[PDB]
Amino acid sequence: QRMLGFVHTAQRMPDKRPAAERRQDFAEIYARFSDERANEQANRCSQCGVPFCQVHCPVSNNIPDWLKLTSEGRLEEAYEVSQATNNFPEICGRICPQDRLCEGNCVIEQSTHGAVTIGSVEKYINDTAWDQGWVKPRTPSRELGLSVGVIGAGPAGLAAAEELRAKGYEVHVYDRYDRMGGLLVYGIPGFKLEKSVVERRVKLLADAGVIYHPNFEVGRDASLPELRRKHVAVLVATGVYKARDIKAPGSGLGNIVAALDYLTTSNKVSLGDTVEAYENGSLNAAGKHVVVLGGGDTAMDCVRTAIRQGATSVKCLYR
Amino acid sequence: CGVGFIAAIDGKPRRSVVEKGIEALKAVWHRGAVDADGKTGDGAGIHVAVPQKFFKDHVKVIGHRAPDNKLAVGQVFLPRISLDAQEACRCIVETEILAFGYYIYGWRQVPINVDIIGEKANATRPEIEQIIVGNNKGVSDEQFELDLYIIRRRIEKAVKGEQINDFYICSLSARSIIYKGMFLAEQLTTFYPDLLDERFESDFAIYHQRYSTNTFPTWPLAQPFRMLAHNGEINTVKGNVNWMKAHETRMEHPAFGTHMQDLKPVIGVGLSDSGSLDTVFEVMVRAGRTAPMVKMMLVPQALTSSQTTPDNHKALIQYCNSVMEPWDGPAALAMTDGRWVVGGMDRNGLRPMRYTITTDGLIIGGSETGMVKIDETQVIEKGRLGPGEMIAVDLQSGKLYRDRELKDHLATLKPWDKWVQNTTHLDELVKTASLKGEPSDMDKAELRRRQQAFGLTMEDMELILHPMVEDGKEAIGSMGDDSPIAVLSDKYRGLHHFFRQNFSQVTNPPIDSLRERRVMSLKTRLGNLGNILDEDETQTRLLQLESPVLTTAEFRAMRDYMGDTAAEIDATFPVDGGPEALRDALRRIRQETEDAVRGGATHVILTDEAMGPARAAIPAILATGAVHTHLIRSNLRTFTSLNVRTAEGLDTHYFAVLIGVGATTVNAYLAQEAIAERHRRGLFGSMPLEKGMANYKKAIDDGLLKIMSKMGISVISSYRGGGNFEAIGLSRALVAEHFPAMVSRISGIGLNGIQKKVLEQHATAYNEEVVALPVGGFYRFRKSGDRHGWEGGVIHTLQQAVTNDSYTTFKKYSEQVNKRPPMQLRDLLELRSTKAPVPVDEVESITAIRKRFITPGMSMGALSPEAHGTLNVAMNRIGAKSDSGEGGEDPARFRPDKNGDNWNSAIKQVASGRFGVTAEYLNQCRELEIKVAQGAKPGEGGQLPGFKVTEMIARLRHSTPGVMLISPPPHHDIYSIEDLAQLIYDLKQINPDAKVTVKLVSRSGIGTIAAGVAKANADIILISGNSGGTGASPQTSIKFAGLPWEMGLSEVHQVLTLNRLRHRVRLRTDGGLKTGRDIVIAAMLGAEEFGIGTASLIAMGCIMVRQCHSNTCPVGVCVQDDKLRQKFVGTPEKVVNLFTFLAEEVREILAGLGFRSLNEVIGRTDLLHQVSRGAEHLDDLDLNPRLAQVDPGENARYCTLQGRNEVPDTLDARIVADARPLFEEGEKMQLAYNARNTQRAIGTRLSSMVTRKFGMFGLQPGHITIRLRGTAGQSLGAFAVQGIKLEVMGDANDYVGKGLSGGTIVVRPTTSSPLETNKNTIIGNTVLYGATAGKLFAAGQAGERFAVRNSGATVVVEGCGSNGCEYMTGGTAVILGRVGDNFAAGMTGGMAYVYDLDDSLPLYINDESVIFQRIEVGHYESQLKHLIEEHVTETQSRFAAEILNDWAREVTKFWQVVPKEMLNRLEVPVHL
Amino acid sequence: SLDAQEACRCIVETEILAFGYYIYGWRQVPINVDIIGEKANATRPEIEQIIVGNNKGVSDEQFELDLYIIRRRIEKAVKGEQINDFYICSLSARSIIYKGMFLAEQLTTFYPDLLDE
């Protein structure tokens, strides 16, 4: 079992490592659940009728069902029922803001009782099923006579390509950069998302049979009418890349670098390509006074990467 | 109402018989329905033997000669209006009486006086005449009777053939005669001066006066009927007519011969239940059986599963149960063959029946004791009647017969003990089944595909499938349902979802299913349907099954046993048949079965295993309906049987609705395979498959018993094919043709949409590659689920709007609610006025409209006291009316605190439990309430979990903490309409200030009950719906009970307008009222006041978690633990703002409509117009059968009377005029009076005066006392306060001490009566109902259901009957005599001190929750000694004095009964 | 009574639909009985109308003969189950009638349908 024990328990997140111990590395902050704490935290759900947890999650997960499952053993069924409506549960459980999407509207949350560790247990139930190969490539039985194209390796493109390969079509991707995955491999950090899991996901999606095209710009290597002539339907997943600026005196000096360039170069030097703009340039933060402009999780990532890469002094302002 | 019979033992005619009969009839005016006109009645009848000498003298006066043999008079009602029909009727009767050889003596017009009957009853008065005939062929008397009966039936048929209506025959025989009419039961001897002559002297006499529901009288519907009387109503009459049609063709007897063919349609047309019972009884008795045998066969004694009766009677009862299907229902029968006279009761003994023997060889019996005046010293025995008993008088030799002797004489006539063992059971075949034949269970993929073929989602297989196999019972819900109806839905809904179960309001009392399980059965009989009039051994050769549902192994065993006579039928139809493949398949099956049954097959086994990718499964329900109805209309169902295998039934509702169609057995082979695959996956743990299957079978049995008791039936043999269901959304033709008799108020989809949905689901299941079951939402909301009512956005918008106190946000909320697709009925109409819009500055005030809405009751047990008090004060702050509901209420909240807010409620309820009902509790309100049947879960009592009863709620409900409180579904006080009238009179007597209201739930034909209660002086009727909330109930009850309040309310309005009764009673609706539009619609339909309910709770902070049944509501509303209570955020300002906004919205919509005040719109049904959904659904719901109306005339469309409806006053009023010093200076008094039986509820208005002057415990015991002489009326001493002592000399009628509250009542016979005290009954049934404080001392035997629901009172009696101390909760009872069977059913508090000599207690006790032992502790010894001392020094019984005398050796004969859960709470350890 | 009306509705519907014609719905004629006598009010029957549309493309004469057979069989049926005071005034696609035991003059004031344009 009876999973209504939220009256005599206390909300406890998984094991987190302290602040100083992370000020020097690139590993993640949160650790994987132990079996005992995970099994306990899965009981606190209330099986609430009209669950306010689902009505807020964007992909509309069947949260209570796999919650009950993971609380009643048999993680397999939980994994399949969670994968049935989501293609990348690890990304969602690691990055999606629970304070406004999942853990911000739980029914017990509105009574100062604190929500349940939905996102982290989501990540867990996804990852713990990877030890025995419970994840399987969604390849079709029979081949269907149609080819389809998608531009951009972002999350939308990846999910649409996987769904089209599940249908029976022939999918081709197009990315401007080499290591595909959209901003999931160059924009977001490595301490937030260890690139190992993203690479495992890319390998699983490639194993279905979809052909990939690394380092292919649609503008110069082809044209939109040419794509319409080759493939019957190209799906646009370019996202957004043109940044803004500020028009005021003082922007005529050097050392003005936007967030995307520094973040991409940091992710690269984390993975490779040995970009020279970091060492043989002013993109480094050895001991300088690196200040950032603007706000949000973007500037948050900027200052966090800064305090990771030396930067004895870092500041951040917001209007 | 009333029924009674008088008889002489020897059989010599005497005028005193009819004299006492008429006299006793003249005193049945207190149970009637006195109206304003005072002249019109509702039917009264008397029945005597033929006064031969009078008619002989008359015919000698005419000029003929009186023959030696006896004469025969035929009394008839002939048409009066047109002179063209009377000639035809005379012609017909003469032609058919002279065609056999008898001699007509002439006609005679009985003198009558039409001056006393009213006008409305006179407009349909027929002409009464009589003919005289005489046996002249010299034939015997029995042949004379048979021939006259056949002639009468032939005349009736021949005159029915000519459509010449308005003709009736009272009775045509040479032994009996009947004087009946629609006059008032008091002035009979004035309407019929014939009974005033000194020659009408008979050996027996029957008298009856009925209580009719409606108001339009029809003369031929007055009792007694031909050779029978009756009281009450028979529940199972729908299936009885069908089984009679089945039995019609397989009966014959040489006593009738050729004319037998003339008696094929045995049951006529246009009669009540007693009429059909009477016709069947007559046509059965005319074959050779006596009266007692026919009574034992028709209404059999409840077959107890014990050894309390010699086995010969058991064999006889088994034979009678096998030969004829029983007839349940509350009934007190007084049947009179020309030789015997038998008075008996039904299976359960729901109505009272008491008889007295004089010392002059004269027996009298009836429903009361002091109707006919008897001397006190000429009484030989005062006796009563229990369940199944029967007392008989034989005039052929002048001999009386009590129960045991009569039944022994009966069972003497045939060797019953040798005919029972000819049959066999099933367990014998099961035990010899070889351990072989294991069918390979289908693969998981196959099972999942077949389940998707019927949309059986996964939440079903774990919400209401796991507990049924694990725990051993059904699931539990926590709130009303907000899913749309089965027709407005979008997903594939099973066909069973279109069937709503039935129940019974005050017209028929439901029966509990947790205590009286001994009186119910589920036996099925294969190979028994056959002859009914003959007697041989060809009726005791059959097979008997204990349960109508079967597993797979037992079903295969039965199929292997049946051999080479079982014909299988494929219930699959090719999906590619065409647009009308379903009709072709149904025609094919309904022809193929009729083909096979004649070829030599005696069994039809309908199967559907042939389902494949090209052939879909025909709905088993529809196929069974068509096949059974064709076998019924083809005179073949008797020849065979019907066993069905399903693939779509999983819950208890499906088996019930399928049996209710006409099938014999039902087998589900999918559920067993799913259970096996779930067990082998190691989900239940370590529970083997056998134990799980056994628990599943037990749960299904419990479910069938509950659903069968929800209506008032006792045995499945009469419910099979009874068609006790309501259909919504089906076409008129389909239901009226394929189903036997089911009323469909609105025509619906035919066979197109059904086949369309079925084929679409089959395609989406089999044609595609599915691997996992869909989640689905039917019991709890989901994103991929259908449209529920309370949506998350809706709740959040309403909460933000009520917190911010913003009108624009509330308007946006209302718009969001209105902009949804159709969900309920009120989404299919549209307002349409014709006048010019009126500016909003001209409609009435906001408070004047706010004073209408109320908030329904909420039990203190289900809710937390905080929200209770918050809602209470929020409603009392503005001036509107609030509610309190059951569960009582704290007394400390009777007066306001210093802050100026009153926590007291404005309305108190009277449920079936009567927990907090004391004297003080019923005088602090301005409105009473009766909880006849709850809305969300009708046919059931208030439930509450075991660990929710804390100290506070237990001290409030007067119960032992830590028990699962289940209030009895029956009411134990409303068994018919007159009992409801009595309770209404009691409630209006105890409180001379307020009114009393009755609650109902919508269903078909509720208008009759409405017009019935309207004659009971009730003034407010609350019609609930089927979408209301509750604390805890089974989901099958929530989703499958009732109808939306639209039809119910719109029909009650029509009916109450049709009988000029609308202008006397108010009307208030509730259930699913959310925004202003629905309020205006409900007011348009004819309502005055309204409710809010769950909506208001959403403003309080309810988040619809639907976990209130676990005492773990996170927001802290339905909680009884101190931890969650401190999370409350409730605030009355929220409710004030909510009501203000609702009133503003209603004002605005009314102003925009075109009127000025609500009181000018009620009843205007023409202001609405139905709008279609379009052509996207092709459904044909026409709501016109609700928009109809009848012109009112001169009175108003609303209630136009201020103040309550006054009722007459009893003797106690004159008592108040004498007790001045007690209410001026407070001095002791001592009064004496001669009280009669026609004075009801003596000692209640005085109790009200006392409790308003002083209180409850403000006086010393025995302050004022009243000595009544002669027998007393009904409801003696109801709600007596401490200080009053009512000493009555004689005997009480009924319901003595109902709700005792500290007083003291004593009953003792007249000291000059030569009666042994402990060998006579002195009180009626239902003693000390709802007692909480006081002492009762009797001097005789007690009735039935003794001291039920006692709380803190003490009682001493000298005997009891069945169901003694049922569901007792606390107090002390000492019985000195013979306790009945099934004693202390569900006793969870108190004690019982029984005195039995023959060690018969271990045979009658209900050893479930109590233990019985010897006396061991000296403390209880002294307590019992002092109790007996108080008894003997109070009433002075000889038996008690003798017991007190020899004390050394009698305590070792006394036994002690103590509840189980109270061993660890007694300060005195009962053990050593 | 509210039990004979439902039975009559079921009878007429299961009789008409046994041939194939579509049934759009019923209609309640507007009335005002404050003008008729008193004795007639004690026996006034409920006045209803039904609408039926052809969907088989059947010509005129066959449709009329079918309507006649329908009316005859439905009258025989209602005569069968012992319910008197039931009647069908005129069932056709060319004729219609308004007849009653009210005063001859008050016709236009009893059936407002005729005051339509």
Ligand SMILES: Cc1cc2nc3c(=O)[nH]c(=O)nc-3n(C[C@H](O)[C@H](O)[C@H](O)COP(=O)(O)OP(=O)(O)OC[C@H]3O[C@@H](n4cnc5c(N)ncnc54)[C@H](O)[C@@H]3O)c2cc1C
């Ligand atoms: C915890 C957290 C952290 C986040 N951190 C970041 C962060 O550091 N940076 C950030 O930007 N967002 C960040 N976000 C936001 C989030 O990553 C984005 O809103 C989201 O991923 C949008 O990505 P997309 O679907 O547009 O894919 P994108 O990756 O934006 O899609 C672009 C893809 O299309 C390709 N493409 C584009 N133009 C062409 C062309 N002409 N021809 C061929 N290929 C082309 C590119 O090569 C690339 O593969 C974060 C969010 C969260 C919750």
Ligand SMILES: Cc1cc2nc3c(=O)[nH]c(=O)nc-3n(C[C@H](O)[C@H](O)[C@H](O)COP(=O)(O)O)c2cc1C
């Ligand atoms: C929490 C709750 C408890 C209730 N308790 C009772 C009860 O004890 N007795 C009773 O007759 N009705 C009870 N009712 C039903 C109400 O009388 C009424 O039908 C209900 O408020 C209408 O529900 P609605 O708001 O959905 O229209 C209860 C309803 C709710 C929501």
Ligand code: SF4
């Ligand atoms: S997160 Fe909230 S709504 Fe969802 S299952 Fe848990 S308690 Fe219920």
Ligand code: SF4
């Ligand atoms: S845990 Fe977060 S990302 Fe995952 S489904 Fe819930 S709200 Fe969406």
Ligand code: F3S
């Ligand atoms: S279901 Fe009941 S317990 Fe509270 S949250 Fe809703 S009112």
